[PDB]
Amino acid sequence: SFGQTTPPLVDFLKDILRRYPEGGQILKELIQNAEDAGATEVRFLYDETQYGNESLWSKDMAQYQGSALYVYNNAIFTPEDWHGIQEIGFNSVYHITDVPSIFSGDQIGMLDPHQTLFGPHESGQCWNLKDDFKEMNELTDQFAPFIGVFGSTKETFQNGHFPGTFFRFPLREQPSQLSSNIYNKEKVLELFDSFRADADTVLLFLKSVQDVSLHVREADGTERLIFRVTA
Template identity: 35%
Template sequence: MASWQGPAIWIYNDAMFNEHDFNSLLNIHEGGKRDDSTKIGKFGIGFNSCFHFTDVPSFVSGEYISFLDPHEKFLPKQRGIQINFLEDENFRKLFNDQLASYIGIEGCGFDKKYEGTLFRLPLRIHQSEICDEIFNTSDVLKFL
């Protein structure tokens, strides 16, 4: 799971995700917002743009941490997983390295519900099925 660690792009949203939002990300190819004129990103361009930089985005929202793996490389037979970090103490112990990068970013910790959504987009470090372009911090800074 080293692909989920290392330099990353962080995105903060002050709203929490709900179950529908999470399921929409698991099924990004279906465009779940297409018929809802009140939503942005309804043409599949929004979140999908993160795959220009990463293969394995993750995010914390409320009491959940979610890992997305659209090619099922790290999460066999699943494109994503959502874990209640407040209830699953075993997860916090076993995957402390995956949680450590979040701690202190926009007030994130794993001792209480996170009031917002914090995305972590680890930079692609190897060529992949999604994209053969790899990135480092200097590459990303050129976009700013």
């Protein structure tokens, strides 16, 4: 027995990140993603909030319960958008996080290129707000980071549908096999700064997205508008 095998997912993606390193390109790639989905608005939120570690899908999920960059847009994923997302585009987010989550309509999906969280040959997991209602309700700490941002409420989960899209990117606090990039508040606000330099012109390329804003949420829950640009 003899032959080549394609590299493991994490190595394939490490190579893509090596070939495309990014600062402020990350915000631009995420804006492009929203434009491609027909969004008219994009909101970035740096969130200081740390969440609980009691009611998680598994103990290894605790490391992703901390500070995050969230990114909202007002389009709702189609099945094709969900297929599309499973494969620089969205992959630039791995500069920031090891486990991005995506919440759109009736589904939350988490991606795990390290392939350790969800079983041995799995690279992510998804929950349906209707079909998995019972489990999601029990896993209070797991889904708290999806409630109370961008107009999502406990009511959202009762109805079973969020009429929009947001991502949660828990900020990597130490190097992984995917990336050694560590983000903190300072580094994220530096990303917000790069963008703000270019903000006018970035909307010139775009025909759907007409409003981009940057916000910060403190641990006490207070939130500030950092910057907005409109068409």
